[PDB]
Ligand binder design. Structure first.
Ligand SMILES: Cc1cc2nc3c(=O)[nH]c(=O)nc-3n(C[C@H](O)[C@H](O)[C@H](O)COP(=O)(O)OP(=O)(O)OC[C@H]3O[C@@H](n4cnc5c(N)ncnc54)[C@H](O)[C@@H]3O)c2cc1C
Ligand SMILES: Cc1cc2nc3c(=O)[nH]c(=O)nc-3n(C[C@H](O)[C@H](O)[C@H](O)COP(=O)(O)OP(=O)(O)OC[C@H]3O[C@@H](n4cnc5c(N)ncnc54)[C@H](O)[C@@H]3O)c2cc1C
Ligand SMILES: Cc1cc2nc3c(=O)[nH]c(=O)nc-3n(C[C@H](O)[C@H](O)[C@H](O)COP(=O)(O)OP(=O)(O)OC[C@H]3O[C@@H](n4cnc5c(N)ncnc54)[C@H](O)[C@@H]3O)c2cc1C
Ligand SMILES: CCOC(=O)c1ccccc1S(=O)(=O)NC(=O)Nc1nc(Cl)cc(OC)n1
Ligand SMILES: CCOC(=O)c1ccccc1S(=O)(=O)NC(=O)Nc1nc(Cl)cc(OC)n1
Ligand SMILES: CCOC(=O)c1ccccc1S(=O)(=O)NC(=O)Nc1nc(Cl)cc(OC)n1
Ligand SMILES: [Mg+2]
Ligand SMILES: [Mg+2]
Ligand SMILES: [Mg+2]
Lengths: 582, 582, 582
């Protein structure tokens, strides 16, 4: 089926064997920045007609773009870098992908084998450095291993709990001629042996039993449900259980649906954390009970039976001890529980209307809210407008901080993989590059990077990439001249004592600095600034209608605070519902 | 002598103990970007009146600035970052500092101790990740250890062979109240035990003997001589031996002096590599025989007695086996050899005029040269002009690539620490941030970042830093729209087959892209472009005269090639002396 | 040339491929104790007709026997063990072989691959455990790798600086059928690249020059000269330089020769340490300047030019900085220096008679001495008698402690590999097993284990091995009822306060306990006890004449002290020349 560009008996460079190894894996896009140790790989890349390369302006842009690509498509993201500084520049991306469980294959050039360990030119013990921040990694020591290693890398990166896999390739192996063997078996006996088997009916039916025996059930959905959109939907319309979601799970279940309790956790809705606090049955599907959503563990879902379904046994019971657990693919568990629920439909007759009502009053008394001052633009409102004008069908990437929380709170995602945000590591500068990858993976979609002025400037060089690759990336920059989140904490716990959180110029405290519009201009990207809430709707519409890339700089009053808020290690009873920096 | 801000019996936060620990070390400048896990440290920083913080726009800008600071002053550079993404963003800087042996202390915030290893919010096993790319590192586990650890970190970072030391501080330890003990002893028994002792006369006199017995002696000076400017000078005026230098040693001995053979190595002068090739005595002081300068080891200084003086025993004999070696401070070895040379002056009567003549003819027949096409600006010439207008007294930082080699070749450094360039790791994006640190460390100096368009855009966000800190950083951008060095190799070994090396826009192949002038404008930094060689001198003069920061975009024809050139693993007989991409 | 037992196209078990891999390496003897995880290997072993297995009674006996085998033959020693407890029981042997640089290949069975890391039955992460105590190690993950790994293991174990290499083989790979490829190349690019090249005449002639310019030269020979017996001899008869030896070098140069200064170091002769203390030229060939022989480094050979020739660059300059060094095979360096010395014979005319005389008076005034009390047997005398009756042609293995020092001091070894003793690690219980290996490697030699009662009982179970394998192992047990060496230190530095150093029975303080004769009897080995010095000569003669194994229990007064003695970190001026525990 796969047509090679070489004769089955024709020897060729390891670099060419590596590129074909990617083509055979179905790879169509890579993000690679050339360097001396990876030149061969780049040369082989130009001979490929099926793989396109998006040249970033910084290796970190490369990884983050690859992540965006992966996060928005469900396919693995592929980035390639040269040795030494090239490789070390990938680090934050690798750690980011590992914490959020993003399938990713990173390939780095390395000095020739004989040179390894000699403090060679541009050498870095990248395999040693990344071991604790990758799912697995490799140092290829023989051109004969390329086919197997690449196959194993993708298998490991995409199977079980997804994660990044780095493959280090010495320059001498890239140049070595050889005849590849695409028939070799993978050496993952231990891993393949531990791969979860399909869920058992005994386990699944025990859950359905618990559901029928509960009066206050709550679904706690996370990133693990990103491929169970339909199954989860069907499950909810069969149990009528309210859905609470993590920052990573947004979109698994439509935030606009009436059964949606939206996001729970530190900056989750009062009613979502309420539901969990008083539930008697917690259906934790595809979540890792992070400190961000649980607060004080002992207090989290204290009065309820916890059912935990995770593909990673290491997660089941790590922070919370379930009353029931299923180690396996939540997608299969749902399909299984669904058949059962459809059959015992009449026999069960599930009705949680009373519970839902208790929550609806909570949703009515404590809804997400924002204040509008004069004609100043409220970031929450800006996002709300973007949602409306895009009919909530846009792919949203973001930086980290207040804008991130607002992008999560005030936009209703219809489907998963519409939300691209760094959650576990929370790396700034992720938004723009992620949007680049998302756009390449989704050419006909509306891709909007809702960034912060601090996060946006970190990888601002990628604007050049966007222009050159002619990608329709829209940038909704919520400019507040500060490091919003750190500032909020300064206000709440440090008597507003500012400590290097102002991003503007102290000499002209009133001038917007820097002028992000000129950054766009430098890369030939049309831009505009908006300061009055009245002109907001038209500015955003313009951004959307103007073909190609576009940067809308939205000025906002910095004293805004993200609410509600449960301080770290807190309880639902410590939730802060009001206040700002005014 | 040191005045604390706390009573000797008054308990205070570990964060405050850490900041005072820095003040007691004489620290006056740090480069810190605030984050949740390091907020306490930042708060304590604002209470200090002796330490100023330069807030970068990216953690990588922070480290590189700290390096620039260190490299231009001889003091350790200090950068601080928050946990997780903050910390991982330091990686390239740490590896860079380790490879070039730059004293540096990096402090990173970390999640609370009890949270370590739990996959906590913004947690990264930074100590595990950086172990192979730092001189040493620490994870503080008790507020009581702060004083000792900080003292050890600086001692280790600055003593022996300088290098980076990272100190990870849990958030709970930053908030813990305690009374510091500044009297605690350091626990470096093994390290302090292995510290080289002052050179022995027996060893030193054996060297002077070799010098008197040689007919073709050559000095091979490197980064280890950065603090031996005077001693080396005196040594040369007592032996009249020609000085060849590494990229790291530039300036140890004035490149303008007649005894100077300039840089040796891959892109070294023909006469420098000549001198070494035919020498009978190689005085390797403060060098590590890198593959970049030796080429094929067996062929390097094949016909001569090698004397190697290094402060790191691990280096002596690593790639080349000396006939004589001295493990110790080259500064002391020189002072020692100098006294001997002054005494046995008449008894010795050293005369290498015949050898120097053989080299002068070589210097005359094969000098550094560049070609001028029409009115196009030759980068070499631009640098040559900068040298003249600044009287060669400027601090020059650079990116990595062709411009770096030209900045090395066509500028005559009078003193060491005038040249700030990433040599071992060769990390792009180093130039602008390094200039920032150099300027802060040298407020009254002319600081010029000779950057490449590829390297410059990587950390372009630091332009914001430059403006806000009101630093007189001048940027001489040699814009060639390409990744010059990779392109040169494509021309020489890949039939000019371009593989993602063009940095401009393919849709407007003739328009300079991006418009670096607008990047400067965005950060309120005056800029100008120059395209005609005739207008070059006035443009540079303007850049220098215009008070404050300034960006001069210098357009150059990309087909330029760095020469001469000895291909990797080559011999002096493989040196390429002509050709380009036209 | 090599005749397989399988058809070149016939598939067979990995176990059989491993055994053939050994046969192809020339292996004729292995020391293997069967276990569940290694059963396949043992089964394949019985099908071999060229490899004999010596079944020890304890895995530690296995390794030590393999060491003895290696140490007495110059061939690598091979031991095989099962997984878990089998493997961990090898540890002391591996560390011992690494510290003394003994070529050794250890093969351990391991649980099936899929079971690794699951806390399986008899599983131990042996590769992780032994990484810091082996030259290198492997975990075979594919039956296809066996041929290459075994070849690499032996190459690494025997090349450069010899050392142990452990190969872990999963049980499933032992049973997997396959067709071996004995043509595969080794993947040791880096290692083979760093292998020392033959010495250069420039370096060698510089040494001969130093020799001619010296008045007080001293040879400091170590374990690295074990294969340079002839070359060293020739070198000495051409320079007439006195030879001092380490505990590891004994026999490289005959201790009986008049030019021999015998052993230097802590328990070295007064004249040997004298020679070094006052020498002006130290020829350190095949030594690692251990703390045992140097004492206080600063004081060691303080007034002299040090020439160091080592095959391990990591050793040159580790503790002492030479004035000259040669990284390479001392055997070749000597052959080179010899040709030079033979030619410039007349031109040089070397005469160190005056120096030798200064030393001969020292050898006359401070010779090795022992005191004889009544009819009590002096251990020194016993060894002296053994030497005479065996004409100093016996292979002597020993335990660790006082008897070891006496075996070193009072026996004159004619050739290297006659002395088998644990020097760097100093592991007790080494003597008996080492003798077993030495005897198998030298069937027609006189093999005597000069053991201590403490060391002897540790691996006393090997007596069973000796009987069953019908090996002519003679055991000269110097029984003193104590842990001699620890006792000596108690006397000198702890006012003779005994702390668990008495090995006899406190209830019958005067009865020799245990009765080692009955241990021999239990294993059908003829034995006898001797208490009167007058009956000593006849007892030893009997031991030697009685065909087969024999144990002579020699009772000695425990208050004996090893002299002379330079306390740790001491100087030649701190040497203790008299005293005991009476
Ligand atoms: C400024 C900031 C504020 C934050 N505030 C909040 C907040 O208030 N609320 C909040 O929720 N988060 C918040 N976070 C995000 C937070 O750090 C965590 O990233 C997030 O809570 C993790 O959610 P998760 O466990 O659902 O998803 P993941 O971390 O993606 O974990 C998914 C889990 O699902 C398992 N799984 C994967 N695939 C499958 C499958 N097919 N079948 C079954 N199981 C599977 C995994 O192995 C894993 O255990 C914040 C982050 C930042 C940067
Ligand atoms: C694009 C590119 C091209 C390059 N081309 C060249 C080229 O053509 N020529 C070239 O020279 N380099 C070149 N390099 C730089 C090169 O990679 C190495 O960084 C450089 O050769 C190292 O020189 P060094 O050994 O002298 O200095 P360092 O790497 O700084 O090493 C200094 C050494 O001195 C020792 N030492 C330190 N302090 C003391 C003291 N007080 N007393 C005694 N010893 C001390 C150290 O421990 C160490 O061994 C290039 C780099 C790049 C990025
Ligand atoms: C109770 C006790 C007391 C001791 N007392 C003493 C004492 O008083 N005096 C004493 O000497 N020792 C003593 N030791 C032994 C001591 O611990 C060291 O094992 C010994 O000094 C090491 O000597 P070495 O360096 O010569 O040999 P090794 O440790 O075998 O080192 C040999 C060296 O030679 C190099 N080399 C190897 N092969 C070659 C080759 N072909 N060409 C060139 N170089 C090569 C190696 O790589 C290495 O650096 C004692 C030990 C014990 C247990
Ligand atoms: C930068 C990558 O370097 C290496 O892989 C490398 C490292 C040490 C020794 C030899 C090589 S090499 O000879 O296999 N390759 C190179 O040296 N390549 C190389 N490419 C570019 Cl573009 C520039 C350069 O040196 C300045 N060198
Ligand atoms: C980001 C640093 O985080 C931590 O140190 C951390 C990690 C896991 C659990 C508790 C904490 S903590 O309670 O000691 N501190 C915080 O959680 N700090 C914090 N600071 C900001 Cl500015 C934002 C935030 O959460 C969104 N959290
Ligand atoms: C002791 C070695 O054990 C193993 O290799 C082992 C470990 C875990 C699971 C399966 C095996 S196994 O099935 O490949 N082999 C055995 O279990 N062998 C085995 N051999 C013996 Cl003589 C006894 C025994 O179990 C009591 N088991
Ligand atoms: Mg902001
Ligand atoms: Mg360029
Ligand atoms: Mg004893």
């Amino acid at each position: 089926t796969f047509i090679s560009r070489f004769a089955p008996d024709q020897p060729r460079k390891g670099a060419d064997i590596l590129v074909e190894a990617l083509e055979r894996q179905g790879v169509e896009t890579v993000f690679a920045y050339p360097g001396g140790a990876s030149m061969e790989i780049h040369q082989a890349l130009t001979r490929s007609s099926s793989i396109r390369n998006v040249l970033p302006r910084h290796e970190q842009g490369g990884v983050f773009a690859a992540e965006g690509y992966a996060r928005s498509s469900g396919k693995p993201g592929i980035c390639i870098a040269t040795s030494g500084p090239g490789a070390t520049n990938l680090v934050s991306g690798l750690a980011d992908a590992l914490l959020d469980s993003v399938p990713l294959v990173a390939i780095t050039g390395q000095v020739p084998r004989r040179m390894i360990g000699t403090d060679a030119f541009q050498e870095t013990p990248i395999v040693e450095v990344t071991r604790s921040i990758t799912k697995h990694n490799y140092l290829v020591m023989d051109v004969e291993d390329i086919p197997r290693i690449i196959e194993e890398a993708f298998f490991l990166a995409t199977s079980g709990r997804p994660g990044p896999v780095l493959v280090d390739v010495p320059k001498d192996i890239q140049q070595q001629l050889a005849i590849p063997n695409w028939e070799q078996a993978m050496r993952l006996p231990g891993y393949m042996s531990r791969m979860p088997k399909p869920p058992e009916d005994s386990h699944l039916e025990q859950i359905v039993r618990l559901i029928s025996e509960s009066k206050k059930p709550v679904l706690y959905v996370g990133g693990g449900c990103l491929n169970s959109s339909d199954e989860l939907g069907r499950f909810v319309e069969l149990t009528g259980i309210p859905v609470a979601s993590t920052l990573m799970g947004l979109g698994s279940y439509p935030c606009d649906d009436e059964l949606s309790l939206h996001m729970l956790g530190m900056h989750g809705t009062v009613y979502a954390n309420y539901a969990v606090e008083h539930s008697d049955l917690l259906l934790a599907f595809g979540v890792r009970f992070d400190d961000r959503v649980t607060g004080k563990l002992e207090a989290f879902a204290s009065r309820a039976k916890i059912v935990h379904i995770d593909i990673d046994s290491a997660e089941i019971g790590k922070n919370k001890t379930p009353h029931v657990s299923v180690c396996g693919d939540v997608k299969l568990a749902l399909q299984g529980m669904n058949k059962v629920l459809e059959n015992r439909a009449e026999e069960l007759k599930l009705d949680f209307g009373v519970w839902r009502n208790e929550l609806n009053v909570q949703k009515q008394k404590f809804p997400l809210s924002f204040k509008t001052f004069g004609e100043a633009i409220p970031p929450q409102y800006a996002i709300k407008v973007l949602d409306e004008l895009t009919d909530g069908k846009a792919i949203i990437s973001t930086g980290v901080g207040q804008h991130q929380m607002w992008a999560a709170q005030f936009y209703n995602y219809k489907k998963p993989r519409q939300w691209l945000s760094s959650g576990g590591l929370g790396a700034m500068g992720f938004g723009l590059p992620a949007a680049i990858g998302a756009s390449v993976a989704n050419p006909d979609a509306i891709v909007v990077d809702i960034d912060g002025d601090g996060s946006f400037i970190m990888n601002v060089q990628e604007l050049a990439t966007i222009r050159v690759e002619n990608l329709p990336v829209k940038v909704l920059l919520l400019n507040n001249q500060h490091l919003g989140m750190v500032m909020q904490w300064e206000d709440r716990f440090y008597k507003a004592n500012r400590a290097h959180t102002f991003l503007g110029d102290p000499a002209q405290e009133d001038e917007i600095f820097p002028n992000m519009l000129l950054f766009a201009a430098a890369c030939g990207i049309p831009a505009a600034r908006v300061t009055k809430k009245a002109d907001l709707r038209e500015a955003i519409q313009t951004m959307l209608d103007t073909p190609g890339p576009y940067l809308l700089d939205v000025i906002c009053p910095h004293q805004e605070h993200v609410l509600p808020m449960i301080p770290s290690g807190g309880t639902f009873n410590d939730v802060i519902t009001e206040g700002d920096g005014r």
